[PDB]
Amino acid sequence: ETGTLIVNSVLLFLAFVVFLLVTLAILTALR
Amino acid sequence: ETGTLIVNSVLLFLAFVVFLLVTLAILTALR
Amino acid sequence: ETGTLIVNSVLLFLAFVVFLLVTLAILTALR
Amino acid sequence: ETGTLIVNSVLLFLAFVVFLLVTLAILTALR
Amino acid sequence: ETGTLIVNSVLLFLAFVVFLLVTLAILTALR
Numbered sequence A, B, C, D, E: 001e002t003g004t005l006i007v008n009s010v011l012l013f014l015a016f017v018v019f020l021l022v023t024l025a026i027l028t029a030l031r
Helices: A006-031 B004-029 C004-027 D004-029 E003-031
Strands: none
Touching: A006 B004, A006 E003, B004 C004, C004 D004, D004 E003
């Protein structure tokens, strides 16, 4: 009906932050 | 009534990203 | 009124996944 | 109107779990 | 219509906590 439905979906984008964390962790561990 | 109810449930899938983080961490620590 | 109210609460369970991450991290660090 | 509005706010408390993770990580790294 | 719509957006701020975790992790790893 409105963006109110997409608002929750937008939050779902937080899943990217997780890979960001591993990005730094792997940047030092490599293997 | 509508998917609006499942939308929140979908976000719950974010729980998988957590194991993904430990996956990389354990891939270097093993033990 | 309906489970729609509990749906958000259910997501709150995600707080457990956090301790799960530290569980593996501490399983290698111990101290 | 009702707690339904606070329910989402309650979930926001999950922000504490994040510091909990760093707490253990820093407990071994110190520096 | 009301803040009820912004409430979900506010939770989105949790994305900051993720960088906070890497902040401590990188504070010890540097590289």
